[PDB]
C-alpha cells in the first residue's frame, strides 16, 4: 500500500 523509500532502505539494511 504505497511502500516508502525509507521503509525499503530500512528493510534492505535490516538484520
Amino acid at each position, epitope marked *: *500500500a*504505497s511502500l*516508502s*523509500l*525509507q*521503509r525499503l*532502505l*530500512e528493510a*534492505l*539494511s*535490516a*538484520e
Partner: antibody
Amino acid sequence: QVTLKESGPGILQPSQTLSLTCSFSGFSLSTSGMGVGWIRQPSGKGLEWLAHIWWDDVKRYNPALKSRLTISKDTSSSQVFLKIASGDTIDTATYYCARIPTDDYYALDHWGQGASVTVSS
Amino acid sequence: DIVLTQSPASLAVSLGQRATISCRASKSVSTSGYSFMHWYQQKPGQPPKLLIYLASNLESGVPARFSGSGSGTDFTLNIHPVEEEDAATFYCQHSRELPYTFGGGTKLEIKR
C-alpha cells in the same frame, strides 16, 4: 493531544530484565505511516536508537544489542512495551519513547519526558 | 554503520548573531531524491525536539531562524539569529540505513 509517557523500574539488579512501557494519546498506532521507537541517553553522553515498531507490526532492533531486545504494541490500550534482557551497568540511562509520524521519513517529532533507569547492586 | 561527526562540538554566539553546526556522515545519507538527515534541539531536562526533517524541511511550529542545508555526506544547521532559549545541545540523525545513529552533539553557549 499528542502525549507519550515512559514508565519503568527506576533501579534494576545487574542481570535482571529491564521492562519499559510507553503509553500514548493524540494518535493511534494503526494509522498508516505511524510508528513508535525507543532512544536512550546516558548521563552527559549522546543519543542511541534502540528499537521501533511500525503501524503494521514490522519491528527493527539495533544490531549491537539485537540479542537482548524485544518490542511489541497494544494498539487497543495505546501502549508500546520494550524488554532488554541481561541488564548491565552500561544500560544505566534515560530511556525515551518517541513517535515516527509518517511512512516517508524516520524522524522523531514528539518525545516523552524520559524515564531514568539506573542498574546497580 | 554510518558515523555522524558534528563540527564544532561547542560554539559560543552573541544574541542576534549566527550559530553554524556541521554534520559529516561517513557514507552518503542521500539517494533518489531524498537526503535522510534530521536535526534536534535538546534543552537541559527535556527530550530532544525536531527542528528539521530531510535536511531542509522546517518542522511545523519551529521558527525559520533554524535553517537546514547539505546533501550526500556534508550537512549544516544554521541558527540565525540566535536567541536566549538556544542554550541547548544540537544533534543530527540519519535514517539512510540501520543502524540509525546520532552525532555526539553540539552545545551552543549564548554570549552575554
